[model samples]
Target: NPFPQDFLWGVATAGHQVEGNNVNSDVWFLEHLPGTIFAEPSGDAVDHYHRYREDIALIAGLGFTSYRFSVEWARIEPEEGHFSVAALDHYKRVLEACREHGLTPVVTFHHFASPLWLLRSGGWEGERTPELFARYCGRVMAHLGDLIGVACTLNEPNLPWLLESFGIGGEAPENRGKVPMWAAAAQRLGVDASTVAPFQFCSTEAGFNVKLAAHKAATEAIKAHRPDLRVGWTLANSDIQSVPGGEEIAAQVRRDVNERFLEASRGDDFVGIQTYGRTVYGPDGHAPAPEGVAVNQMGEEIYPQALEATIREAWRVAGIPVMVTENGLATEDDTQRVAYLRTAVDGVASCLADGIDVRGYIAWTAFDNFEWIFGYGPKFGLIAVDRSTQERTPKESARWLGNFARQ
Candidate 1:
């Protein structure tokens, strides 16, 4: 049995993660600072900015019906109140290419990268953050709305809180100042620094409130510009299961992080579910990985069934249609990816069998690209790229998914 004909089958990528030379972005600043925790700078990340046409062709060639990519806020709005028409035009071309290839464009307005100016001016914690985000969304939608199939207000709005639960960065208001030891451990494990640095970028409760406000404001602004386009935000679904005596703690964590955002997304056209792997919550909090189970480059337990667990929870809380916006494993083994994808698709199929409104599935990434502070150590792409030559070679897993999509 195959998914419904209209169901979108695609791949996803973020601007800063794939597009090279994003030097104007705030994240680039953090990556190059002295004594920085970033494993390696995203020097020329796959050169997707110049090679997107070829990349779009790859997706089309793979038989995917959709492509999810982000517009770098830092690129379009490099300066405050000064939007770059040239930058806007560049993304417009990207959108045009997607349509040319018969691929639906799932455009995310923000995916963690912001202009350095925005960060200098207090970042997301600033009093004007919501309005600032709305203004940006308004401009982008007004410019590219006609080509966009779906507009994600923001990507993984609950990430800060979710990472904090793992003792990553939740403790203090100014957590980003200190580097975590895990950054070094990640290096020793032969993975990228971002696998650990993400947990280090924490935000306060006030900051989380600002993000929610920003999402609401962004949604309104996008709809105002293009009412026909579907608007929603994606949440990081941790798919946590509780050990016998740990139910209370697990529920507490879910209420504070996962459910809080899903509840906010109640009136959205569709909520995005980004589940990569599942975690176990025990009496002492996040328990050690179960013995004998496979782990990814990030050391997270390999549990593809987490997709079903996550989607069920999303429907239970938001009561809206859902999209599996980002789901993939970080492993060098293509066979593991093939197995994981099969399990994940089966999980989604089971949800559909039960009458859940699961709209589509987009792999976390389309190409092997920079992964924040982790640099390029973790490979989560269906299409692997050669960094030196900027050559993209589709892996066996990509052919497997492409064949599946064709069915």
Candidate 2:
């Protein structure tokens, strides 16, 4: 069946993940540190900064109607109080190209990477983080707001909080005997631990509160810049399931990590829901994916139906329109990727049939680029990239998806 006439059928990518040489980003600074946790530096990430025209062409060529990508915060404001008009101009050009290609642009402001200066000054822990973030949003909006179709204040702001709760990121217990990414970066820059905590890695009540505050302030600021600009933030909400004995634990865990954020999103134009795999909570805590089930490059179960679970909960909790902003498999097996997406898209159609105000479905990525920590190994793209020559090869899944949308 056809989606709403105005549906944003598209694919998504982040700046640091696709654009190369983001030297001013805090993640870049950390990746180069002596004891960095990144498996490999995100060096020359697919060179999309210079090749955005080609990239935009690729999305349009694939028959998609929209493209959701981030404008690098680090590039626009490399240093504190120093905004770069040049970078804003560059992004405006990117938006212009999208318009020329007959594609609507869904722009994201802060997508995990902050300017290195922000981290050196105190990252999310700084009392000024929210204001500084809002300031950046205002500046970007002033420069390129008119070109943007939709605005996501932040990408997966709740991710760091979730990683922290599971003890998986900067402070993972498994990281014993090795330097955590945040701690090493902090020491290298001679800043306090809290000062250099990246939102994707640092998971503390204090840091979590700061990100929440930053989003509200940024949302308010963006509206000031363009009152009609649709604005909201994305959440990293996995489909949380529970064993019979662990129902209460699962609900509490879901409440702690998701319900609060969903409730927070009620005032916005829409909330971006990003779900990867299923998270089954057991009596003790997180239960592993069912034994011997198919897993992807990221070692998560290949549960494409996971999308509906998250979409339903998002609409239920927030009572706001939702967008499947990011959902895709990280797999080298092209066939599996196709199977996974088919299931995911079917779920979206089902949601629409039930009268859920789901706005769009943008895949996790357009091309296989840099994946944080896990590095470039986990390929999550509709189009595969040849790093040696930077060639973009549309996999079979890309054609399948585009054909389905066009139908």
Best by lDDT: 2
**Residue pairs of candidate 2 with colliding backbone atoms:** none
User: What would you estimate as the lDDT of candidate 1?
Assistant: 0.84
Alpha-carbon error at 216 in model 2, in Å? 1.4
Give lDDT tens digits, candidate 1, residues 1-407. Answer: 64787998989999889999999886787777666667999978999999999999998998899999999988898889999989999999999999999999999999988886775545666668789989999888878889998888888878877777778565454333345443443344354343323211535766777788888999999888788888899988889779988899888788988898889899899999999877778988888888848888888788899999999999999999989999998999989999999999999999998999989999878998898878999999999999999989998878888788888
lDDT of each: 0.84, 0.86
Off by over 4 Å in 2: 170-180
Indicate the residue-level lDDT of 35 in model 1: 63
After superposition, the stretches of candidate 1 with alpha carbons farther than 4 Å from their true spots are: 174-200
- The TM-score of candidate 2 is 0.95
The local lDDT score (0 to 100) that residue 191 gets in candidate 1 is 42
TM-score against native, each model: 0.93, 0.95
Ten-residue segment with the worst summed lDDT in candidate 1?
191-200
